Amino acid sequence: DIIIATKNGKVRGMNLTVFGGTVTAFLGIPYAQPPLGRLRFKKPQSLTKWSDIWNATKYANSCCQNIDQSFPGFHGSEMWNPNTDLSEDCLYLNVWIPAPKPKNATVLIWIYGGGFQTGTSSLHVYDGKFLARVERVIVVSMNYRVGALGFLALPGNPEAPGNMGLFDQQLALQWVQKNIAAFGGNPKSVTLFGESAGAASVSLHLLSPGSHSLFTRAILQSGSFNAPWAVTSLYEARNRTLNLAKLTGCSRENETEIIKCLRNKDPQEILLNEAFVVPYGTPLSVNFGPTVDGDFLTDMPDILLELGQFKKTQILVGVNKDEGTAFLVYGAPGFSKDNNSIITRKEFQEGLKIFFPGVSEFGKESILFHYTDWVDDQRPENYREALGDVVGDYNFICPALEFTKKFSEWGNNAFFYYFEHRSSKLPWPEWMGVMHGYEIEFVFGLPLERRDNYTKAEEILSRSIVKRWANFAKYGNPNETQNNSTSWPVFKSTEQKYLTLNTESTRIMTKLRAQQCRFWTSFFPKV
Amino acid sequence: IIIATKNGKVRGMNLTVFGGTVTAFLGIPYAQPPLGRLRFKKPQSLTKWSDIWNATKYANSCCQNIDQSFPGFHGSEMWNPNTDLSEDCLYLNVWIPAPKPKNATVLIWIYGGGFQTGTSSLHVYDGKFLARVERVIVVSMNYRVGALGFLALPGNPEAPGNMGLFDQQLALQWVQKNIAAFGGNPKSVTLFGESAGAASVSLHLLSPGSHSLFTRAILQSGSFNAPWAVTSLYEARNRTLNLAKLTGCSRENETEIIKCLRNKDPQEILLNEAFVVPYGTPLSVNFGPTVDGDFLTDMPDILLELGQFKKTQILVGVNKDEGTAFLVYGAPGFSKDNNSIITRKEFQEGLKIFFPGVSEFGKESILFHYTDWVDDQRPENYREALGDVVGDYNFICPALEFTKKFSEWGNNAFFYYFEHRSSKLPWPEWMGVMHGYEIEFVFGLPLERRDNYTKAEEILSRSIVKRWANFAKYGNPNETQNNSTSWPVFKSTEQKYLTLNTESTRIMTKLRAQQCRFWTSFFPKV
Ligand SMILES: *[C@@H]1O[C@H](CO[C@@H]2O[C@@H](C)[C@@H](O)[C@@H](O)[C@@H]2O)[C@@H](O[C@@H]2O[C@H](CO)[C@@H](O)[C@H](O)[C@H]2NC(C)=O)[C@H](O)[C@H]1NC(C)=O
Ligand SMILES: *[C@@H]1O[C@H](CO[C@H]2O[C@@H](C)[C@@H](O)[C@@H](O)[C@@H]2O)[C@@H](O[C@@H]2O[C@H](CO)[C@@H](O)[C@H](O)[C@H]2NC(C)=O)[C@H](O)[C@H]1NC(C)=O
Ligand SMILES: *[C@@H]1O[C@H](CO[C@H]2O[C@@H](C)[C@@H](O)[C@@H](O)[C@@H]2O)[C@@H](O[C@@H]2O[C@H](CO)[C@@H](O)[C@H](O)[C@H]2NC(C)=O)[C@H](O)[C@H]1NC(C)=O
Ligand SMILES: *[C@@H]1O[C@H](CO[C@H]2O[C@@H](C)[C@@H](O)[C@@H](O)[C@@H]2O)[C@@H](O[C@@H]2O[C@H](CO)[C@@H](O)[C@H](O)[C@H]2NC(C)=O)[C@H](O)[C@H]1NC(C)=O
Ligand SMILES: *[C@@H]1O[C@H](CO[C@H]2O[C@@H](C)[C@@H](O)[C@@H](O)[C@@H]2O)[C@@H](O[C@@H]2O[C@H](CO)[C@@H](O)[C@H](O)[C@H]2NC(C)=O)[C@H](O)[C@H]1NC(C)=O
Ligand SMILES: *[C@@H]1O[C@H](CO)[C@@H](O[C@@H]2O[C@H](CO)[C@@H](O)[C@H](O)[C@H]2NC(C)=O)[C@H](O)[C@H]1NC(C)=O
Ligand SMILES: *[C@@H]1O[C@H](CO)[C@@H](O[C@H]2O[C@H](CO)[C@@H](O)[C@H](O)[C@H]2NC(C)=O)[C@H](O)[C@H]1NC(C)=O
Ligand SMILES: *[C@H]1O[C@H](CO)[C@@H](O[C@@H]2O[C@H](CO)[C@@H](O)[C@H](O)[C@H]2NC(C)=O)[C@H](O)[C@H]1NC(C)=O
Ligand SMILES: *[C@@H]1O[C@H](CO[C@@H]2O[C@@H](C)[C@@H](O)[C@@H](O)[C@@H]2O)[C@@H](O)[C@H](O)[C@H]1NC(C)=O
Ligand SMILES: *[C@@H]1O[C@H](CO)[C@@H](O)[C@H](O)[C@H]1NC(C)=O
Ligand SMILES: *[C@@H]1O[C@H](CO)[C@@H](O)[C@H](O)[C@H]1NC(C)=O
Ligand SMILES: *[C@@H]1O[C@H](CO)[C@@H](O)[C@H](O)[C@H]1NC(C)=O
Ligand SMILES: *[C@@H]1O[C@H](CO)[C@@H](O)[C@H](O)[C@H]1NC(C)=O
Ligand SMILES: *[C@H]1O[C@H](CO)[C@@H](O)[C@H](O)[C@H]1NC(C)=O
Ligand SMILES: *[C@H]1O[C@H](CO)[C@@H](O)[C@H](O)[C@H]1NC(C)=O
Ligand SMILES: [Cl-]
Ligand SMILES: [Cl-]
Ligand SMILES: [Cl-]
Ligand SMILES: [Cl-]
Ligand SMILES: [Cl-]
């Protein structure tokens, strides 16, 4: 029998067959009291011992969230939708241990993304069994409250203070500290990693002192807190909370009466009103997300970073080549996943209105000008690809580069990557390229399964990315081998060297899209 | 020796140039003196004189303000007039090879000076070397500048505008009716000029009255589509009424304003021209060409797009550092006597001086486009960016635009880019290859070996002198020497041009295209 004794009771696990070996899996371990009833909108309360044996034998419920039904039956959009039942009772975590049991393994802890409104740790592409089997690490993931139930903010009021989902994550990190040694893990070798809003979450754990003692190193894939979508200002969050009360019939005089009212609404009557709390919303609007709660985050994050008040440790950071294209099919005129999406100069200007609703006409013109210095003005696809780059540069690439730059200047080793490979099984059209979220299966080893119709070069790439990630976790260095391997050099603010990742040639390059990012760092804020 | 003009007889003189002889006629009158009741009117054709005119000395230069910013400094005073000033100034010069030629091509020079200054008798416009070395006839003329040449009340023949342009046209007319008596071919005539003279040349390409008076055109550092080249009818009227206010000539109708301005001492007109525009820059053109309904029937850019101009070959070019000259006449931190290192805040202050009507957003976009440094460390970055802003906007990018549009009508265009800094240049090294300092090479001054030029400068000057004369004679700026690079036509697709310098003359494409894309496709939207 597969049984491990946690400090909240015993828990029973499960054996998995992975590449002629065994991976012991505990799926759905609870880490907090279910945020039901009077605990709705509050920080996670710690758990009390249970008598029996908890059966960590299946994935648990995913936290309440709206679903993406833009393309029913499409694997491209539905692979991100939750694959378990939805419930407010969702604060569970999973653990993958290599077999035979290790004596002191390094732990990788995964924070999924989803714009702080969607996501779940039980998706097929976050399966930690391959990492555990191939690299001998313990892999941990946790479900955390998303949407208004996770990030509703009446700042200073304990009944709904903001950043609950971030505290959800942090309490899972407290569990790993208190419990992972019992499974074979080293609490002193813990690496957080995550993608998109999960990468923004990872970078926020670097700033928050409460998290500092709970992990060793960080990996940020396609996200960081200085992204334009990551953090809501103190009082914009409160004003979206009030608009939600009004939208549900919960506008009261004192705040505790608003929260008391919101607690009697059904989850689905809250979810159906979240989209409306912001007046003109981009396809990248974070309705309810992190805020300066004065508890998890004591100041706006850009200030803490500039003043050097953050955890001093090594970071691995990177972005994909076409981060932006995924968002053009969700509201830009002339874009479909089913045609080649060739657009015109005015269809471009209307695309910019969708993504920059508050920017002036002079500002929207300067953007268009910076992205229209064609190398071949005969190329029809010019405007289709220019708009994807604008969305990609402004929202993901340039902030991640600027975060790495600023972080590197305080004396800790940073590494930057450019993921350039398109999946051979990607369900989306060609014109979208190396999309947001499509390095994850390569990081989690899914191409190592040959039963899965992957190309041999993709297995070699995935095997290489898996080794580099797990080595960065163990040693603070993302090396593959000492010989027959490109040395991945440190990102330094002068040279700004990064490593590209693809099947043809992994190269050391410099100053990724500097001419583009110079626009967003040095001209766009002045507009 | 004496030659018979259709209006009288003129006596010349013999010049010994490089062992040979050049026959010069300096100071032939081509129009009645625009005095008293002819002030502000178009030039009137001249009456015959019975005796002999002695065209043996440079004539009076037209009334104009003098640059006295740097007293005793050759770099500025070499552009000041070197004959006495007077409204009696409509004379011209003629240089002829010796022995007398047969049917020689004529090069007619039109000087610049912002339509405010200039004379044909400057040392750097000496046509004796051009005649000796290439056996061409060289003609230059004086034309009225300032308000005395370009005061405009549109529709009124007492002050119609463009009077200085008609001065030039009447000199071109003189050449058609007299250059044969001298040995020249009236049907082989090439206009060339620099700056305001180049812009003037390009305006003769548009005006129908001038079409039959020349064959080809050379445009050095200037063209009519430059921001400084043409005053709109509105600002021309606002500047004419301001001048009357400043001289006590504010009247109720136009005819009386002109009667009053005709009785003002020339210095009282000259010394008020500076105050007619409130927000001026070092490139301000107080009184210049306008849409007069006569010399220009429409706005020049409209004429250009529509193809209503003289179709012929053109030779067009610019220098590398066109903008520097103007940075020492207003921009803060700049001086001819130090290295003029400036800061980002001082760069923002220079922009305000050259773009006084532009929003802070627009001035920000200029700044941003010119600060993508190749080397972030070099302290000369902002000094080089400002002179590049002034040069690109005012000279380089208009001249490229002109050549593209002109050539698209089936005309052979040739574009050059002058990169040589004169070893004798009196201005500091940071100003580089300044506006106006290719003229010595076009006119053959470095061919005088007793002059402190370098050997390479003599070689370079001979190449340009040859290419220029060949373009006039044949329509192709080829050089006869075997080792010379072949000069291709400028066309809209490939946009090929020829660099000029001592080292090696290359052939390049799309000159400064990245900078000029700002000035054509984004700046008119701020
Ligand atoms: C705070 O937010 C309010 C939002 O009021 C709105 O009402 C909600 C119920 C929801 O329907 C939102 O989409 C609405 O925008 C801002 O209010 C603005 O001014 C009036 C006031 O009600 C509103 O009708 C306008 O639509 C809002 N303006 C815009 C441009 O949408 C308010 O400005 C925000 N800030 C502050 C300080 O209160
Ligand atoms: C050593 O192994 C290489 C594989 O490794 C490459 O891996 C990249 C991540 C990067 O670090 C790079 O510097 C490094 O060279 C083998 O080379 C490959 O060889 C096969 C043929 O067997 C080719 O089909 C592959 O395209 C090629 N991959 C390349 C060049 O990236 C090779 O087995 C071995 N080479 C030597 C010299 O020992
Ligand atoms: C332009 O105006 C001049 C003069 O303007 C005169 O207008 C009058 C109303 C009056 O206020 C007077 O003080 C002012 O000077 C005209 O010349 C004038 O012609 C009239 C004959 O009709 C004479 O009686 C005036 O003495 C004479 N004035 C002068 C100064 O000579 C002129 O005719 C007029 N022309 C046009 C086209 O408007
Ligand atoms: C058209 O001309 C008017 C008249 O302006 C004055 O400017 C002085 C320097 C001087 O030449 C004087 O003789 C002349 O009267 C211009 O008007 C001025 O505009 C500025 C704003 O830029 C105001 O501050 C002034 O008060 C105003 N003056 C007057 C008398 O109204 C006007 O700007 C000009 N327009 C154009 C497009 O050139
Ligand atoms: C070519 O240069 C010589 C002298 O070379 C330079 O020497 C410098 C110290 C300075 O004097 C500078 O002016 C000069 O250019 C010129 O010869 C001298 O010119 C001055 C007047 O400018 C006469 O007074 C001298 O007698 C004369 N000869 C000397 C000093 O030996 C010469 O004029 C010049 N040529 C041209 C065309 O500029
Ligand atoms: C990757 O690089 C690290 C160095 O950053 C290597 O680390 C050492 O690893 C061994 C275990 O094999 C330890 O016993 C040492 O104490 C480590 N030293 C340091 C300074 O980190 C690691 O072995 C390398 N891995 C590969 C596959 O080359
Ligand atoms: C697991 O590895 C850690 C080291 O990461 C071991 O801890 C020791 O070394 C730490 C730093 O290198 C220090 O904290 C201590 O020296 C020590 N840790 C203690 C005393 O808690 C840890 O013992 C290992 N556990 C095993 C091998 O079972
Ligand atoms: C799960 O699989 C593991 C390994 O495949 C089983 O446990 C091991 O079984 C092997 C062979 O029977 C023994 O040599 C090891 O000593 C066992 N390890 C431990 C820790 O017991 C285990 O029986 C399987 N679980 C089941 C069948 O429930
Ligand atoms: C967990 O499941 C228990 C029964 O499952 C089984 O019995 C044990 C002894 C093992 O043999 C296991 O493989 C079987 O599947 C329940 O009795 C128990 O109540 C469950 N736990 C909870 C918390 O409900
Ligand atoms: C130069 O001088 C005389 C002067 O009459 C002129 O006619 C002739 O061209 C020249 N003399 C020669 C060439 O002997
Ligand atoms: C014409 O020029 C000659 C040349 O010296 C001179 O002798 C003669 O007096 C001049 N005639 C005039 C000025 O009438
Ligand atoms: C030269 O002059 C003659 C004189 O009649 C004229 O016919 C001819 O057209 C002119 N041009 C050339 C190129 O000969
Ligand atoms: C250059 O000289 C000018 C005028 O004397 C002065 O205003 C400027 O500050 C000086 N700059 C430098 C760098 O010497
Ligand atoms: C494809 O998407 C929609 C049609 O469903 C349309 O708006 C768009 O123009 C199409 N693209 C084409 C025809 O290129
Ligand atoms: C250039 O001059 C004319 C014009 O084409 C021509 O007769 C001559 O052969 C050309 N010479 C060279 C070297 O191109
Ligand atoms: Cl996602
Ligand atoms: Cl395509
Ligand atoms: Cl000049
Ligand atoms: Cl003007
Ligand atoms: Cl007078």
mmCIF file of N, CA, C and O in Angstrom, chain A residues 271-317:
data_model
loop_
_atom_site.group_PDB
_atom_site.id
_atom_site.type_symbol
_atom_site.label_atom_id
_atom_site.label_comp_id
_atom_site.label_asym_id
_atom_site.label_seq_id
_atom_site.Cartn_x
_atom_site.Cartn_y
_atom_site.Cartn_z
ATOM 1 N N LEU A 271 -20.017 34.966 -11.456
ATOM 2 C CA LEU A 271 -19.239 34.774 -12.674
ATOM 3 C C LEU A 271 -19.884 35.471 -13.870
ATOM 4 O O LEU A 271 -19.185 36.044 -14.716
ATOM 5 N N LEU A 272 -21.217 35.456 -13.951
ATOM 6 C CA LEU A 272 -21.894 36.058 -15.097
ATOM 7 C C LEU A 272 -21.830 37.577 -15.105
ATOM 8 O O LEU A 272 -22.243 38.181 -16.100
ATOM 9 N N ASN A 273 -21.323 38.208 -14.044
ATOM 10 C CA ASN A 273 -21.215 39.661 -13.979
ATOM 11 C C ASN A 273 -19.780 40.160 -13.995
ATOM 12 O O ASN A 273 -19.566 41.375 -13.978
ATOM 13 N N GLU A 274 -18.793 39.264 -14.005
ATOM 14 C CA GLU A 274 -17.407 39.706 -13.889
ATOM 15 C C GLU A 274 -16.963 40.473 -15.127
ATOM 16 O O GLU A 274 -16.152 41.402 -15.026
ATOM 17 N N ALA A 275 -17.479 40.101 -16.302
ATOM 18 C CA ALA A 275 -17.021 40.727 -17.538
ATOM 19 C C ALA A 275 -17.385 42.203 -17.593
ATOM 20 O O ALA A 275 -16.705 42.990 -18.265
ATOM 21 N N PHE A 276 -18.429 42.599 -16.874
ATOM 22 C CA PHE A 276 -19.004 43.928 -16.998
ATOM 23 C C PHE A 276 -18.390 44.955 -16.050
ATOM 24 O O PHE A 276 -18.717 46.143 -16.163
ATOM 25 N N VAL A 277 -17.512 44.550 -15.126
ATOM 26 C CA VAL A 277 -16.995 45.511 -14.154
ATOM 27 C C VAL A 277 -16.024 46.512 -14.775
ATOM 28 O O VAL A 277 -15.725 47.539 -14.158
ATOM 29 N N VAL A 278 -15.533 46.246 -15.980
ATOM 30 C CA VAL A 278 -14.624 47.154 -16.673
ATOM 31 C C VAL A 278 -15.354 47.673 -17.910
ATOM 32 O O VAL A 278 -16.075 46.907 -18.570
ATOM 33 N N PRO A 279 -15.249 48.976 -18.239
ATOM 34 C CA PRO A 279 -16.156 49.553 -19.249
ATOM 35 C C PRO A 279 -15.848 49.115 -20.672
ATOM 36 O O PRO A 279 -16.705 48.527 -21.350
ATOM 37 N N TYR A 280 -14.631 49.401 -21.132
ATOM 38 C CA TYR A 280 -14.122 48.946 -22.422
ATOM 39 C C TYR A 280 -12.954 47.999 -22.153
ATOM 40 O O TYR A 280 -11.884 48.428 -21.704
ATOM 41 N N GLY A 281 -13.159 46.717 -22.436
ATOM 42 C CA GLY A 281 -12.221 45.675 -22.073
ATOM 43 C C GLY A 281 -11.520 45.093 -23.288
ATOM 44 O O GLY A 281 -12.161 44.699 -24.262
ATOM 45 N N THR A 282 -10.195 45.064 -23.208
ATOM 46 C CA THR A 282 -9.337 44.407 -24.181
ATOM 47 C C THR A 282 -9.537 42.893 -24.101
ATOM 48 O O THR A 282 -10.024 42.379 -23.092
ATOM 49 N N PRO A 283 -9.197 42.142 -25.170
ATOM 50 C CA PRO A 283 -9.154 40.676 -25.033
ATOM 51 C C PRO A 283 -8.154 40.195 -23.984
ATOM 52 O O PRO A 283 -8.043 38.985 -23.736
ATOM 53 N N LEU A 284 -7.420 41.129 -23.364
ATOM 54 C CA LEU A 284 -6.463 40.824 -22.303
ATOM 55 C C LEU A 284 -6.844 41.465 -20.975
ATOM 56 O O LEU A 284 -5.972 41.680 -20.129
ATOM 57 N N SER A 285 -8.122 41.781 -20.772
ATOM 58 C CA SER A 285 -8.537 42.429 -19.534
ATOM 59 C C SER A 285 -8.511 41.438 -18.379
ATOM 60 O O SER A 285 -9.078 40.343 -18.470
ATOM 61 N N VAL A 286 -7.840 41.819 -17.301
ATOM 62 C CA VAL A 286 -7.879 41.088 -16.042
ATOM 63 C C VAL A 286 -8.933 41.784 -15.193
ATOM 64 O O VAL A 286 -8.693 42.863 -14.642
ATOM 65 N N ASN A 287 -10.116 41.181 -15.105
ATOM 66 C CA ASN A 287 -11.211 41.810 -14.377
ATOM 67 C C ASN A 287 -10.889 41.905 -12.892
ATOM 68 O O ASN A 287 -10.847 42.998 -12.317
ATOM 69 N N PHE A 288 -10.630 40.764 -12.260
ATOM 70 C CA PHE A 288 -10.253 40.699 -10.852
ATOM 71 C C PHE A 288 -8.927 39.955 -10.735
ATOM 72 O O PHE A 288 -8.870 38.744 -10.965
ATOM 73 N N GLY A 289 -7.869 40.680 -10.377
ATOM 74 C CA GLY A 289 -6.555 40.106 -10.257
ATOM 75 C C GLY A 289 -5.788 40.725 -9.111
ATOM 76 O O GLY A 289 -6.376 41.344 -8.220
ATOM 77 N N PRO A 290 -4.460 40.570 -9.101
ATOM 78 C CA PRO A 290 -3.674 41.080 -7.975
ATOM 79 C C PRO A 290 -3.795 42.588 -7.857
ATOM 80 O O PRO A 290 -4.106 43.294 -8.817
ATOM 81 N N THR A 291 -3.564 43.067 -6.640
ATOM 82 C CA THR A 291 -3.677 44.475 -6.300
ATOM 83 C C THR A 291 -2.711 44.730 -5.156
ATOM 84 O O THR A 291 -2.184 43.794 -4.553
ATOM 85 N N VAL A 292 -2.470 46.007 -4.864
ATOM 86 C CA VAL A 292 -1.605 46.359 -3.743
ATOM 87 C C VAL A 292 -2.414 46.201 -2.462
ATOM 88 O O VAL A 292 -3.002 47.165 -1.973
ATOM 89 N N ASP A 293 -2.482 44.992 -1.908
ATOM 90 C CA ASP A 293 -3.380 44.783 -0.774
ATOM 91 C C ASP A 293 -2.825 45.325 0.537
ATOM 92 O O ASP A 293 -3.547 45.318 1.539
ATOM 93 N N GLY A 294 -1.578 45.803 0.557
ATOM 94 C CA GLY A 294 -0.923 46.179 1.792
ATOM 95 C C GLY A 294 -0.573 45.026 2.697
ATOM 96 O O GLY A 294 -0.068 45.255 3.799
ATOM 97 N N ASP A 295 -0.825 43.790 2.269
ATOM 98 C CA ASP A 295 -0.477 42.604 3.046
ATOM 99 C C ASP A 295 0.430 41.698 2.222
ATOM 100 O O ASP A 295 1.624 41.598 2.523
ATOM 101 N N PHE A 296 -0.093 41.037 1.184
ATOM 102 C CA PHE A 296 0.764 40.252 0.306
ATOM 103 C C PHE A 296 1.723 41.144 -0.465
ATOM 104 O O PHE A 296 2.848 40.733 -0.764
ATOM 105 N N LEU A 297 1.307 42.375 -0.751
ATOM 106 C CA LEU A 297 2.060 43.329 -1.560
ATOM 107 C C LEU A 297 1.958 44.691 -0.883
ATOM 108 O O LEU A 297 0.880 45.299 -0.882
ATOM 109 N N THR A 298 3.064 45.180 -0.314
ATOM 110 C CA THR A 298 3.022 46.412 0.472
ATOM 111 C C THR A 298 3.162 47.688 -0.361
ATOM 112 O O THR A 298 2.965 48.784 0.174
ATOM 113 N N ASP A 299 3.482 47.584 -1.645
ATOM 114 C CA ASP A 299 3.572 48.756 -2.505
ATOM 115 C C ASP A 299 3.340 48.296 -3.934
ATOM 116 O O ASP A 299 3.327 47.098 -4.215
ATOM 117 N N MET A 300 3.136 49.255 -4.831
ATOM 118 C CA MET A 300 3.088 48.909 -6.243
ATOM 119 C C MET A 300 4.366 48.162 -6.621
ATOM 120 O O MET A 300 5.452 48.516 -6.143
ATOM 121 N N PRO A 301 4.279 47.109 -7.439
ATOM 122 C CA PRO A 301 5.442 46.221 -7.590
ATOM 123 C C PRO A 301 6.625 46.888 -8.258
ATOM 124 O O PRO A 301 7.771 46.542 -7.946
ATOM 125 N N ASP A 302 6.387 47.839 -9.163
ATOM 126 C CA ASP A 302 7.499 48.479 -9.852
ATOM 127 C C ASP A 302 8.386 49.243 -8.878
ATOM 128 O O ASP A 302 9.595 49.372 -9.108
ATOM 129 N N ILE A 303 7.821 49.702 -7.764
ATOM 130 C CA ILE A 303 8.608 50.419 -6.764
ATOM 131 C C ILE A 303 9.478 49.450 -5.964
ATOM 132 O O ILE A 303 10.674 49.692 -5.767
ATOM 133 N N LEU A 304 8.897 48.334 -5.501
ATOM 134 C CA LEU A 304 9.682 47.332 -4.774
ATOM 135 C C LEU A 304 10.842 46.818 -5.616
ATOM 136 O O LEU A 304 11.948 46.613 -5.102
ATOM 137 N N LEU A 305 10.609 46.597 -6.914
ATOM 138 C CA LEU A 305 11.679 46.147 -7.799
ATOM 139 C C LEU A 305 12.772 47.200 -7.911
ATOM 140 O O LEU A 305 13.958 46.900 -7.736
ATOM 141 N N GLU A 306 12.389 48.450 -8.197
ATOM 142 C CA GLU A 306 13.387 49.499 -8.384
ATOM 143 C C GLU A 306 14.234 49.700 -7.127
ATOM 144 O O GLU A 306 15.448 49.913 -7.217
ATOM 145 N N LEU A 307 13.622 49.606 -5.944
ATOM 146 C CA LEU A 307 14.347 49.757 -4.684
ATOM 147 C C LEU A 307 15.095 48.498 -4.263
ATOM 148 O O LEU A 307 15.704 48.493 -3.186
ATOM 149 N N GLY A 308 15.055 47.438 -5.068
ATOM 150 C CA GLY A 308 15.781 46.227 -4.749
ATOM 151 C C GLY A 308 15.244 45.450 -3.570
ATOM 152 O O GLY A 308 15.982 44.672 -2.965
ATOM 153 N N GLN A 309 13.976 45.640 -3.219
ATOM 154 C CA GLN A 309 13.358 44.903 -2.120
ATOM 155 C C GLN A 309 12.659 43.687 -2.718
ATOM 156 O O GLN A 309 11.485 43.732 -3.084
ATOM 157 N N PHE A 310 13.406 42.595 -2.835
ATOM 158 C CA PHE A 310 12.864 41.320 -3.284
ATOM 159 C C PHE A 310 13.846 40.234 -2.888
ATOM 160 O O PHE A 310 14.974 40.514 -2.479
ATOM 161 N N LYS A 311 13.396 38.987 -3.013
ATOM 162 C CA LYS A 311 14.253 37.836 -2.746
ATOM 163 C C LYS A 311 15.477 37.838 -3.662
ATOM 164 O O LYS A 311 15.361 38.026 -4.877
ATOM 165 N N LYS A 312 16.655 37.626 -3.083
ATOM 166 C CA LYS A 312 17.889 37.582 -3.862
ATOM 167 C C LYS A 312 18.214 36.127 -4.198
ATOM 168 O O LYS A 312 18.664 35.362 -3.341
ATOM 169 N N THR A 313 18.001 35.752 -5.451
ATOM 170 C CA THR A 313 18.163 34.369 -5.874
ATOM 171 C C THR A 313 18.194 34.340 -7.401
ATOM 172 O O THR A 313 17.987 35.361 -8.065
ATOM 173 N N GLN A 314 18.461 33.158 -7.953
ATOM 174 C CA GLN A 314 18.596 33.006 -9.398
ATOM 175 C C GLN A 314 17.230 32.845 -10.050
ATOM 176 O O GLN A 314 16.329 32.224 -9.485
ATOM 177 N N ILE A 315 17.083 33.399 -11.263
ATOM 178 C CA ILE A 315 15.834 33.336 -12.022
ATOM 179 C C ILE A 315 16.086 32.840 -13.443
ATOM 180 O O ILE A 315 17.107 33.146 -14.068
ATOM 181 N N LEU A 316 15.117 32.093 -13.964
ATOM 182 C CA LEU A 316 15.089 31.672 -15.361
ATOM 183 C C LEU A 316 13.837 32.273 -15.991
ATOM 184 O O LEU A 316 12.726 32.067 -15.490
ATOM 185 N N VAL A 317 14.016 33.032 -17.075
ATOM 186 C CA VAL A 317 12.940 33.807 -17.684
ATOM 187 C C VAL A 317 12.962 33.591 -19.190
ATOM 188 O O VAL A 317 14.023 33.416 -19.788
#
